[PDB]
């Protein structure tokens, strides 16, 4: 009004203004006249439906008024061939770039002004575009999530992605991050195919990530039968179903056309020994674990919780000083799995780093004490429930549970962890140890290590 | 032009603004601010001379009447003329104080070369402009100055084929000569501003208020922290000058040096040659001409003074050999039994006493040279002032000879003490 205009022209407070009173109200007492409503939490209900095409929809009902979360999960790095290795990384580096309905700048502005967040994360055999925002901004945000998650890559997007992928590769090489070491581990484990393709993609194929290759990748892999849409905090399932239908209904059914299909993954017991002249030696010893289908997966997680929390610290890090750091790796895949240890320590005692490490893993095969098992299970429960308490992570794991087991199992994770016993963990680890080892070593004196046959004999 | 590698600074408006907005100046005293005073006096000279140019008609027969009439009918014109004259005086004072200060600090090192020479060139140009300005007065002083300059110019050509005509037409002040010299004066006066800017940019490379290397790393931001101090020091020096002029020059005076400016070219034909005297800043050169009655030797003395003033860093500098240069010595060779001598190293300023003694002898000789007119009517029939000859010869020796600057005695004595102490303590 005129009074506000006058009091803004001269930067002087308007004492009588109600907004001034509200903003300058003493924090010790509530603002006069305002008293928000009170409400109690409600049990969460999960509902799953399928469209005429293969797209699936999952909703977690509102438990308490909060920001709505949405997401799209694509079963589509395992589905990358040497022709199009690293496409998913380029998509990640330019996940906000769309040109069909909304622009890169405009959808970034949508993210910024909605006050929420929008992220894209991809693993082997999965990509996930998640977003969280206020309810009244949900619709628009979803229009961005779907397009960014389903629109074919544009030439400008691919051009930007090539540069960003090159920068990412340079940064990874400069930092010597454990991700590159894991890439080498998977290369030797599976053999540059299926799960063996590097997560960040081959560096020699970066220049080939043109819009044509990305579009070929999307056409081959992205199909309605492998698209899951998820919402969390939605009062009505049907409202979100309609919201999705308004966007993903156009996608034609892929039935009747030869599908790409995923080749069954084979495990290879290779070894890699790289001389890097590093003052520290990094070793990794892995074996084939069980897939998601097998019930032993939980046990394996407990085994990891038995190492990364209680054992591996005391037996290796505390007793020996040359152990820079040791950890237990546990990856699960739809058709295979990996479980083992990754250690790093002084190069001059590389052999001492290896033997002891094996013993620790072998100790698990020997048996587990009751107290250690209880501690590991308690720590695993704490971590899992800390993850589940946050709505976004809960929704992501809900999507993954639906896409893997066709039902929701995160509601009874605690019971599954409780059901685990020491005997099951010991037997599972003993069975895993019998598999052909996959051994990787990068260090200054990796040239002097026990032979692969000696490694197997020690493991035996 | 592959020999020319480039320029230290690109004097573009963007880069100049950035450089002067990010400039830093170390803490200093008034003695190291004569350059700013010179530049500010140059700026005021530019402004006042531009104001004067709109009043001065370059015809010789109208300049006196025009000046007299336009001081009354127009307000502030005589104020600008007085400001111009006093600005010339203060510009000479500040420039010579700056020269003495920079000679004192032994700025003949190689790292000072670009700083030094760029300055001297400016000074040299600053001389020429002043000369042209004198000619514009169209008095008997201007007549004598023009005649002397024309004779000096004609000296190089052995008085053959009127090579001076393109500027000093007939060696007299007329319409053509006045017009040409006035336009050249204006153009070179404005060129002095750019020369000063270049010199100021160059000299900041290694700027020091004192020879001693203070370890301070923090510095003042130029725009206001240093600029305010520079303006205040200018104010203080101007107050001191006002006091000195007020007391030393009574309101009415008898036998001033301006009395030779009574005669106006054209109006008065006869010239009172008994009392011929230029302004005090050109007094030393007229005194040198009177002391040295030989024309060629006097011209050579002037040229040598200016050019040796230009080439100080080369004769007295390190020369990039790191003091391994070998001098030529007349008598010290017999004492040391060596044909040449390595240049001495320890030539500090504040500590050593020989440097201060020689520098102050040189400065006092310069002051004595400017102190008075030799009065050539009988300056040679009467055995001339021996002090003037001594001061001139010491000026010549100090500028050019490296035995009065960077002397070998200090280095030899210090090495003798070093050897004795090391022998005693092993």
């Amino acid at each position: 009004s005129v009074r506000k205009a006058f009091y803004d022209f001269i930067y002087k407070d308007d004492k009588s203004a109600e907004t001034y009173k509200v903003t300058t109200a003493d924090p010790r007492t509530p603002v006069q006249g305002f008293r928000g409503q009170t409400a109690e939490d409600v049990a969460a209900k999960y509902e799953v439906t399928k469209l005429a095409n293969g797209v699936t929809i999952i909703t977690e009902s509102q438990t308490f008024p909060s920001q709505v979360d949405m997401g799209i999960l694509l079963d589509v790095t395992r589905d990358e061939t040497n022709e199009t290795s690293g496409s998913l990384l380029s998509i990640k580096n330019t996940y906000l770039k769309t040109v069909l309905n909304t622009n890169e700048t405009i959808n970034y502005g949508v993210v910024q002004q909605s006050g929420g967040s929008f992220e894209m994360e991809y693993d082997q055999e999965t990509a996930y575009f998640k977003a969280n925002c206020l309810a009244h901004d949900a619709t628009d945000v979803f229009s961005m999530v779907a397009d960014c998650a389903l629109e074919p890559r544009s030439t400008v997007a691919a051009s930007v992605g090539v540069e960003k992928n090159q920068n990412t590769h340079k940064l990874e090489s400069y930092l010597k991050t454990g991700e590159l070491f894991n890439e080498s581990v998977f290369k030797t484990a599976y053999g540059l195919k299926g799960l063996g393709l590097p997560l960040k993609g081959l560096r020699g194929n970066v220049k080939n990530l043109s819009s044509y290759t990305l579009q070929k990748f999307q056409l081959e892999n992205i199909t309605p039968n492998r698209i899951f849409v998820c919402a969390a905090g939605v009062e009505s399932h049907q409202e979100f179903v309609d919201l999705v239908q308004t966007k993903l209904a156009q996608i034609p059914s892929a039935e009747g056309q030869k599908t790409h299909q995923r080749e069954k993954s084979e495990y290879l017991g290779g070894e890699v020994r790289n001389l890097t002249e590093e003052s520290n030696v990094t070793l990794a010893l892995l074996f084939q674990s069980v897939p998601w289908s097998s019930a032993d997966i939980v046990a394996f997680n407990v085994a990891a919780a038995l190492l990364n929390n209680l054992r591996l610290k005391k037996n290796l890090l505390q007793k020996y000083a040359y152990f820079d750091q040791a950890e237990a790796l546990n990856f699960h895949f739809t058709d295979s799995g990996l479980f083992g240890l990754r250690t790093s320590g002084s190069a001059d005692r590389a052999k001492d780093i290896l033997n002891h490490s094996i013993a620790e893993l072998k100790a698990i095969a020997s048996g587990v004490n009751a107290d250690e098992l209880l501690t590991a299970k308690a720590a695993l429960k704490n971590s899992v429930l800390s993850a589940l308490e946050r709505q976004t992570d809960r929704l992501e794991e809900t999507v993954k549970n639906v896409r893997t087991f066709n039902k929701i199992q995160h509601t009874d994770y605690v019971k599954q962890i409780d059901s685990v016993t020491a005997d099951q963990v010991a037997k599972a680890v003993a069975k895993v140890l019998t598999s052909n080892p996959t051994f990787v070593a990068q260090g200054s004196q990796v040239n002097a290590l026990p032979t692969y046959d000696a490694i197997r004999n020690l493991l035996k | 032009m592959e020999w020319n590698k480039g320029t230290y600074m690109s004097t573009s408006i963007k880069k100049i603004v950035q450089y002067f907005s990010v400039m830093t100046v170390s803490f200093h005293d008034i003695n190291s601010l004569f350059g700013f005073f010179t530049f500010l006096t140059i700026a005021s000279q530019l402004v006042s001379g531009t104001m004067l140019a709109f009043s001065l008609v370059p015809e010789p027969m109208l300049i006196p009447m025009v000046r007299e009439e336009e001081d009354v009918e127009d307000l502030y014109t005589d104020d600008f003329f007085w400001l111009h004259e006093r600005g010339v005086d203060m510009l000479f004072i500040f420039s010579y104080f700056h020269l003495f200060r920079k000679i004192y600090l032994n700025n003949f090192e190689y790292e000072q070369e670009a700083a030094w020479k760029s300055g001297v060139f400016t000074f040299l140009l600053f001389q020429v402009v002043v000369f042209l300005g004198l000619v514009l007065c169209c008095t008997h002083l201007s007549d004598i100055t023009l005649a002397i300059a024309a004779n000096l110019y004609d000296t190089f050509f052995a008085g053959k084929g009127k090579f001076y005509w393109w500027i000093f037409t007939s060696k007299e002040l007329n319409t053509d000569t006045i017009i040409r010299l006035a336009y050249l004066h204006y153009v070179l006066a404005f060129f002095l501003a750019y020369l000063g800017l270049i010199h100021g940019v160059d000299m900041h490379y290694d700027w020091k208020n004192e020879s001693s290397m203070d370890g301070l790393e923090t510095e003042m931001i130029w725009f206001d922290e240093a600029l305010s101090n520079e303006l205040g020091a200018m104010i203080e020096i101007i107050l001191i000058v006002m006091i000195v002029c007020f007391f030393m020059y009574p309101e009415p005076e008898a036998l001033s040096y301006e009395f030779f400016m009574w005669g106006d070219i054209g109006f008065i034909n006869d010239v009172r040659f008994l009392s011929v005297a230029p302004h005090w800043y050109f007094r030393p050169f007229m005194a040198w001409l009177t002391v040295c009655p030989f024309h060629k030797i006097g011209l050579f003395g002037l040229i040598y003074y200016f050019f040796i003033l230009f080439y100080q860093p080369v004769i007295h500098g390190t020369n990039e050999q790191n003091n391994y240069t070998k001098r030529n010595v007349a008598f010290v060779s017999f004492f040391i039994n060596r044909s040449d001598i390595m240049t001495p190293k320890y030539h500090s300023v504040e500590d050593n006493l020989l440097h201060q003694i020689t520098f102050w002898l040189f400065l006092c000789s310069a002051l004595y040279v400017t102190s008075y007119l030799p009065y050539g009517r009988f300056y040679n029939r009467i055995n001339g002032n021996y002090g003037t000859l001594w001061s001139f010869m010491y000026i010549f020796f100090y500028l050019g000879n490296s035995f009065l600057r960077r002397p070998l005695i200090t280095e030899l004595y210090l090495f003798n003490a070093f050897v004795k102490s090391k022998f005693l303590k092993k």
Binding site: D8, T19, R28, S66, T105, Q112, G115, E389, Q391 | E217
Partner: protein
């Protein structure tokens, strides 16, 4: 391009390739408080990180666009709704009870911060940011920052929006 967004600080930071991290900290205590910016970046941009956060806040003393107000408002709403982990919410409740003897509900905070306007923002900024004193620390390579490493004219005039921003835009 950095300009094509609704954040001025991010607009400035996008043009600085080597300035890697920036975070704004508000630390309130019983008697006093500290509100400021922490930058971590290459020393070549030392004079930018030094003079950046000072300028932007001071600019808000005179003019703040409605886009920034609404961006901050939506961010605050999302932050209020996003505190869902038991440990963090318990810690916040305990701290609020300690320093206020009261638990401030989400609705009350939303009402208080939504009522802010351009004029109120400008007045608060001039009360707390315009032409005010500063506490500055620079840890790391100071070869280019050693000169002018004192509380000179530039430091005092940096808290003026558009006045004293000379040193930020150079380099």
């Amino acid at each position: 391009t950095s300009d094509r967004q609704y954040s001025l600080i991010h607009k400035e930071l996008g043009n600085l390739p080597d300035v890697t991290i920036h975070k704004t900290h508000y630390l309130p205590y019983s008697d006093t408080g500290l509100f400021g910016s922490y930058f971590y970046g290459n020393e070549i941009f030392g004079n930018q990180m030094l003079f950046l956060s000072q300028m932007i806040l001071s600019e808000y003393a005179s003019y703040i666009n409605q886009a920034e107000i609404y961006r901050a408002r939506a961010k605050y709403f999302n932050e209020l709704l996003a505190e869902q982990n038991s440990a963090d919410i318990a810690s916040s409740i305990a701290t609020q009870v300690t320093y206020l003897n009261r638990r401030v509900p989400r609705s009350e905070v939303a009402k208080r911060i939504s009522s802010l306007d351009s004029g109120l923002i400008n007045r608060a900024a001039t009360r707390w940011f315009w032409d005010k004193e500063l506490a500055i620390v620079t840890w790391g390579p100071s070869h280019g920052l050693i000169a002018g490493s004192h509380y000179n004219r530039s430091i005092k005039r940096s808290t003026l929006g558009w006045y004293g921003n000379t040193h930020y835009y150079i380099v």
